Input
Amino acid sequence: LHSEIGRLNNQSLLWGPYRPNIYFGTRPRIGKSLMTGLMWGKIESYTDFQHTVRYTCEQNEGMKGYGWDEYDPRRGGIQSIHDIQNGLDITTSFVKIPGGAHGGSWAARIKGTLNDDAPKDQKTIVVFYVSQEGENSELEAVPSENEFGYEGDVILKGRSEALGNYKLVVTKGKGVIPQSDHDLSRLRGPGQTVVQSLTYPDEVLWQAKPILFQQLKAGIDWLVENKYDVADPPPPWQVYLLANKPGSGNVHIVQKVFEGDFEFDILFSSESAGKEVTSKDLEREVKQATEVFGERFARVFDLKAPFQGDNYKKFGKSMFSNLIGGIGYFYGHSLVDRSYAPEYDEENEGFWEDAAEARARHQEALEGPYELFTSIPSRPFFPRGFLWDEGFHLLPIADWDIDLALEIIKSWYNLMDEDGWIAREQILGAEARSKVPKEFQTQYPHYANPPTLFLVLDNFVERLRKLDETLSTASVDNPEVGLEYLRRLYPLLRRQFDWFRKTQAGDIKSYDREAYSTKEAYRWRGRTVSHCLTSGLDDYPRPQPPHPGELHVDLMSWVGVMVKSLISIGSLLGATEDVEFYTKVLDAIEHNLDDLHWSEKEGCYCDATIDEFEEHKLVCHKGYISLFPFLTGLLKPDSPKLGKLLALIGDESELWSPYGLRSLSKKDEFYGTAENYWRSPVWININYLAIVQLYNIATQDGPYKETARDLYTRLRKNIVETVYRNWEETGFAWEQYNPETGKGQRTQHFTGWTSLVVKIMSGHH
Ligand SMILES: Cc1nc2cc(-c3ncccn3)ccc2n1CCCCCCN1C[C@H](O)[C@@H](O)[C@H](O)[C@H]1CO
Output
């Protein structure tokens, strides 16, 4: 029965607009298959369209904003694009229609409305770009009746092993189509929809912009060769209208020019299903997906006081939809240094210079191919899987659709190599690589990242203990399906635990260091003089200089998170021997957090190193790192140390700002220095952990119940209100928030863990 829910999940999730790196396109969860993408741009001159055309996501002065207003990957949703440069408000509606054997059908409506500033007679070029990879697959544009292009719909008929037979239609659409009275119209037509059907080697089909432009350039070269010149030039929009040439190929460019507002549909009909998809179907499924979305939101994300108002519902729906709507399917090779150069062991003083040398051997090579199905932090700046981000992303996604979340967990865990490593940053294929400088592509088998995916697993387990609708919860409603999922995953969880202990081990035994356990001590590999990228907190201050004797309290706390999870999951599976090992490890981490990291003088946890004199020294920098045993859920509710942590947390002169907790204390010497990334700003993911733990202390008998109740109340309010005020003013979720001014800063469109705000509002953890 487990493989039955599995098959249904596969069929459910196969199609989506799973190309979040571009404004709008679709792809199935298959490496080498059919992909679509949208392009549009005003044209006012002979040279402007190369500058105005839109395709890959960005964020700059010329784009007011864009994002999903509703989305569910099983059903589809609606996206809104507000484009200032091109004077256009665009809506892209996407809907899926189950049926047949190949993952069903789908349809999209693209609607453009000029805004108030645009010339009422703007010419906008619109391209629908279609490609198909596969040796034994075919795709053909049925030619038109008319001489120079299409008066009606463009039908592409295709076939592959993965999709069977299918037709993809681009409807004629509604809006004024400009007409040219130039002589050229005797050879190119007066103006109409055109199709060019092309073939290029499979591996470059993703390069839609250059492919389109090479065709535009050939058209213009043709003008020049044939005596169309500046004495009497055709209008720009006709100079940039491709000559119609439909056929078979692995690339099909469908181009329309509109004057004023426009709209058109794309209808993908899987042959193996009922009759084909119509526009009437598209409109009905769109209306239906909205109603379903509406009803699930109010059940799953029931906003509590004081955020019950409609302004907050709208806010929550926006933050949620952007998060779950950034889900992508990525496919290809990634770049990995598999030398395991000994310099990566970081065993000597000055290790960062040795590691630099090894990186300068450039032994890295492409490997795979791999696939990943994942949500991402940032459509415009970094639209790809990040390992510890994904644990935060899936917390609200799991509320929505636990089965989808498990799908994504599985996807990540299928990347893990034989040692237990998953690369923290998943740049899969040439398309992904295109948006990343070559110096930053290389992954390193010694670099960890927080295991925040265990958090999602913990939520799943509590739920397991305590048709699209049915599927979304099938793995908790069918407990046998649940445990079977854990059974297959568990060995990989254990592999990653062991990997952490073998690769990120700190050194107790070799210094004058005393502690309850000889074993439990951890140090993030990969640190530079000013950074510790693998920890997730890039530039939070760490012992200076970095040192093989360093110990990092956040890392030990992450290991504590892992054992606690393995206890739970081991128990469910009766891995009795495993469970007793985990038990001794937990107990040991509990003692060693105190013996190695607790500072009585400072009243918080600290990283540690070793002295010029070879002695253990705590290095205290009050901020997120200091609270880690608390944030990761490792302290007993009655703990005196917890009490001191709550005092530091609430202290306005240290961490507590009107806008959330500061990443670093105002009192720290590194406050607001250098790039100031994690050295003062408020970050939603860590604030979210704080909120969850305050709520935990707050809803149990103990000495800190009422303190935590008050802190919980206020921090929930501060964090929610700050992210809401910024969203109201700017339309954006931001990467972090300024603790002096409350302003969002760094990167926009960070959905992204900022969207945790939906779970914070809906409460009852
Ligand atoms: C190559 C690159 N080009 C970039 C361009 C712009 C940019 N900005 C404004 C305007 C224009 N351009 C910005 C950044 C750019 N990058 C770096 C990519 C990695 C950043 C990771 C963010 N984040 C850092 C967190 O500390 C970490 O915890 C977390 O896991 C991670 C993933 O969310």
Summary: Residues 377, 381-382, 386, 388-389, 436-437, 440, 536, 538, 747 surround WUR (CB under 6 Å). The first helix runs from residue 2 to 13.
